[PDB]
Curated annotation (Swiss-Prot):
GO terms under biological process: import into nucleus; mRNA transport; NLS-bearing protein import into nucleus; nuclear pore complex assembly; phosphatidylcholine biosynthetic process; protein import into nucleus; protein targeting to membrane; regulation of nucleocytoplasmic transport
Protein name from the UniProt record: Importin subunit beta-1
InterPro entries on file: ARM-like (IPR011989), ARM-type_fold (IPR016024), Armadillo (IPR000225), HEAT_type_2 (IPR021133), Importin-beta_N (IPR001494), Importin_beta (IPR040122)
Species in which this protein is naturally found: Saccharomyces cerevisiae (strain ATCC 204508 / S288c)
Lineage: Eukaryota, Fungi, Dikarya, Ascomycota, Saccharomycotina
Subunit structure: Forms a complex with the importin alpha subunit (SRP1/KAP60). Interacts with Ran (GSP1); interacts specifically with the GTP-bound form of Ran (GTP-Ran), protecting it from GTP hydrolysis and nucleotide exchange. Interacts with nucleoporin NUP1.
Top-level taxonomic group: Eukaryota
């Protein structure tokens, strides 16, 4: 094939309006990437530099090559990397790299950009292996003083892209961090004519910061970088200014420990002075700088409480600066958007957020300046000042001590509730939020007789106001109820009928503008969840309403709906279904007569042409109906089964995770009438986890439902025991697929599922210890991971379950055949931590006592 006809092949694969030409070209290209990757990659690179091929064809060549080298799927990235390494000759790789570097210098920024991404993808693969030694040197060369502006810019973009796409824990970019910094500092220095080069250099700098820790440990290099970034804040271009403050933020975020000298010599005064900048975004960046300081200092204070001996150490920057920073935060609150419906982020929102962080970090120290400003401005004639006063007051409701907050709530609450009558939409919106902050953080300060009637009334007024106010009032009512339903004389239930009535009115508005209708439905979910036998009449009001409202949506001809109304109907039904599921669950008492009617609607909803959007919500309501009926659900199983088996096998769709949740629901609701579907469910589940096309969230879901099945079928599970235990072992030994926070949190989810599997299996087999024996050591390996990993043990339910397994396995083996596991220090000590752990519940402590008693029994044997 020639360059020209490979170009035409790419253009056809999407840029052709014939669908059939498209599929054929797509397919031919895939065959080509598979049969001869060398030639595929080669031709891509020479289409990219072909000055005779049209722009988008050259750009396509780069981005389609890049997408054959690099992926967000870990196994695919590992596969693409091995293909490039083994299937392409070093000589061909050389030409492709050379071509990518030629395209990088294109005077056409769109070409130089796609080349930048491609260079970064090749670097991803090659730098870890020490292939491409020339690259970092070329990047230093390309950013050098004498280079064209475009060469400098595109090279900084490439380094930028390199740093982004690299694994955050990788060693390649760390080992060449000097040359990364040289190139970046060459573009970011004030000696540079181009605002585009400086911006690119500072943007690349932010991306590089994690990889330059070795340069940051050296005083001379750290001093020089800080000098460069500070000088950049003094640039005439205001985009360069924000980017430099952006770097200062990130640097503070990652290198807090080196910041004291720079704060003292330059940064404290600089950042506090440009807080007064007329440029919203620059003023925002300095506010974010201080937000970062607070965040760092809050984390340090939490580290000296978790591990009281710890190395790290606060410098109390925020606390020292209150006299300068806070008054500047207060003035910035008055920079709200003129349009009350504008929503877009601005410095006044940055300030509010920073002020909240200052209250959390600095505590009672924040009180004096803020309360002053609140008193000064709550009765002011400018709406900007009255809204700023309520923002400021709501911002200090978390942090100061309980005695201070309770006192100032008492003083201020009447004047705050009066502001619900204000003529400014902005004031009322913020007032509604401030009441929710009071309710959420200082609920005890709301006297049931003195304050609560007025608080309820204000929420009722706001639900009837503009949607922006109504949305905040719903979330406030949620806070109110969540907080005041635990009280021993609980006063919130007296207001249930009127609150529920206001929410029903609000859920009934014409649309969901500013999320006011959806808010009201969520609030109704809370009302249903928290209801008591005392408020059955008003709980029946909600159920009547949502049934009524569901039947109204289903009579609509969807064919006739506009783009906006289609979107709006979908989400309304979603909202209705969510409350309905809660109703079914909270009160399985009213459920069995309407059950044939409910299921008739749910099936109809699954036939509804746009069922994809609501099928999740429908499945969740069916699940709730199942749990409510137990055996009474079985009659629906044969008509529902077709839908269920289809959803289960949609392994790349979130409905399959919900469908697994359904098996968990019926196994628990039928439990031993469940035995007869169990073998067939086991086979289906084994194929769903074997499937490569599976959504990642499904592995945890499938592993957990094995525990539910085992729990409910008991000794019948034994033939499946070895297969399931092998999936759990392989799961518990799987490390994070990379160094990101997302891969880590997924590892934790898998481990939490393995725990659920072990819990179910032990319970189902508690009368069959011989079957479980060979796996006891493996279950203790997993327990040792819970005791070692903080993201596991510090979780109440995870610790209760793990220590519950310790004690249950003990009771299961009174013969002393596993007693050696029970004389281990780690086991004894982990039991003691769960017993003591200040932030564990009394159910978690009782479970640890039980494991301790069982453990002591084991030592006697």
């Amino acid at each position: 094939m020639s360059t020209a006809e490979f170009a035409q092949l790419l253009e056809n694969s999407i840029l052709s309006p014939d669908q059939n030409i498209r599929l054929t070209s797509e397919t031919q290209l895939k065959k080509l990437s598979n049969d001869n990757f060398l030639q595929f990659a080669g031709l891509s690179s020479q289409v990219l530099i072909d000055e005779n091929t049209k722009l988008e064809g050259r750009i396509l060549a780069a981005l389609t090559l890049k997408n054959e080298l690099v992926s967000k799927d870990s196994v695919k990235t590992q596969q693409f990397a091995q293909r490039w390494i083994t299937q392409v000759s070093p000589e061909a790789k050389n030409q492709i790299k050379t071509n990518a570097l030629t395209a990088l210098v294109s005077i056409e920024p769109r070409i130089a950009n796609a080349a930048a991404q491609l260079i970064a993808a090749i670097a991803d693969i090659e730098l870890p292996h020490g292939a491409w030694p020339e690259l970092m040197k070329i990047m230093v060369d390309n950013t050098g003083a004498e280079q064209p502006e475009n060469v400098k810019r595109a090279s900084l973009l490439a380094l930028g892209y390199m740093c982004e796409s690299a694994d955050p824990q990788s060693q390649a970019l760390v080992s060449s961090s000097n040359n990364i910094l040289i190139a970046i500092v060459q573009g970011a220095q004030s000696t540079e004519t181009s605002k585009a080069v400086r911006l690119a250099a500072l943007n690349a700098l932010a991306d590089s910061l994690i990889f330059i820790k070795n340069n940051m440990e050296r005083e001379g290099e750290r001093n020089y970088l800080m000098q460069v970034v500070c000088e950049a804040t003094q640039a005439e271009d205001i985009e360069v200014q924000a980017a430099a403050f952006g770097c200062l933020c990130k640097i503070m975020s990652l290198y807090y420990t080196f910041m004291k000298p720079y704060m003292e010599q330059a940064l404290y005064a600089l950042t506090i002075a440009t807080m007064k900048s007329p440029n919203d975004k620059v003023a925002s960046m300095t506010v974010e700088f201080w937000s970062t300081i607070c965040e760092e200092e809050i984390d340090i204070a939490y580290e000296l409480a978790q591990f009281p001996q710890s190395p790290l150490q606060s410098y109390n920057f925020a606390l020292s600066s209150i006299k300068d920073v806070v008054p500047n935060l207060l003035n910035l609150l008055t920079r709200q958007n003129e349009d009350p419906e504008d929503d877009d982020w601005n410095v006044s929102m940055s300030a509010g957020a920073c002020l909240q962080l200052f209250a959390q970090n600095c505590g009672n120290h924040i009180l004096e300046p803020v309360l002053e400003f609140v008193e000064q401005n709550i009765t002011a004639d400018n709406w900007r000042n009255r809204e700023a006063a309520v923002m400021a007051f709501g911002s200090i409701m978390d942090g100061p001590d309980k005695v201070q907050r309770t006192y100032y709530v008492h003083q201020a609450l009447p004047s705050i509730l009066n502001l619900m009558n204000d003529q400014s939409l902005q004031v009322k919106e913020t007032t509604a939020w401030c009441i929710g902050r009071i309710a959420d953080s200082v609920a005890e300060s709301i006297d049931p007789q003195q304050h609560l009637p007025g608080v309820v009334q204000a929420c009722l007024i706001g639900l009837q106001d503009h949607p922006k106010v109504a949305t905040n009032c719903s979330w406030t009512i949620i806070n109110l109820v969540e907080q005041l339903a635990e009280a021993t004389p609980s006063p919130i239930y007296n207001f249930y009928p009127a609150l529920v009535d206001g929410l029903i009115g609000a859920a009934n508005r014409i649309d969901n503008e500013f999320n006011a209708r959806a808010s009201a439905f969520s609030a109704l979910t809370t009302m249903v969840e928290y209801a008591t036998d005392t408020v059955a009449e008003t709980s029946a009001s909600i159920s009547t309403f949502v049934m009524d409202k569901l039947g109204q949506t289903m009579s609509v001809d969807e064919n006739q709906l506009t783009l906006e109304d289609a979107q709006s109907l979908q989400e309304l039904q979603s909202n209705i279904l969510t409350v309905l599921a809660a109703v079914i669950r909270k009160s399985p008492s009213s459920v069995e007569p309407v059950a044939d009617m409910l299921m008739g609607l749910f099936f109809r909803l699954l036939e509804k042409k746009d069922s994809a959007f609501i099928e999740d919500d429908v499945f969740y309501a069916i699940s709730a109906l199942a749990a409510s009926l137990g055996k009474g659900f079985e009659k629906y199983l044969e008509t529902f089964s077709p839908y269920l088996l289809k959803a289960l096998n949609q392994v790349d769709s979130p409905v399959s995770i919900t469908a697994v949740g359904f098996i968990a629901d019926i196994s628990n609701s039928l439990e031993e009438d469940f035995r007869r579907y169990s073998d067939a469910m086991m086979n289906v589940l084994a194929q769903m986890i074997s499937n490569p096309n599976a959504r990642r969230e499904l592995k945890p879901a499938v592993l957990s439902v094995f525990g539910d099945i085992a729990s409910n079928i008991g000794a019948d599970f034994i033939p499946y025991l070895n297969d399931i235990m092998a999936l759990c072992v392989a799961a518990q030994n799987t490390k994070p697929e990379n160094g990101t926070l997302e891969a880590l949190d997924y590892q934790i989810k898998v481990l939490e599922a393995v725990l659920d599997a072990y819990v179910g299996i032990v319970a189902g087999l508690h009368d069959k210890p011989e079957a479980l024996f060979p796996y006891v050591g493996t279950i203790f390996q997993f327990i040792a991971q819970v005791a070692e990993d903080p993201q596991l043990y510090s979780e109440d339910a995870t610790s209760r379950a793990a220590v519950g397994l310790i004690g249950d396995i003990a009771a299961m083996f009174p013969d002393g055949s596993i007693k050696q596991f029970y004389g281990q220090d780690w086991v004894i000590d982990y039991i003691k931590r769960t017993r003591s752990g200040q932030l564990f519940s009394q159910a978690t402590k009782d479970t640890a006592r039980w494991a301790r008693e069982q453990q002591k029994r084991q030592l006697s044997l």
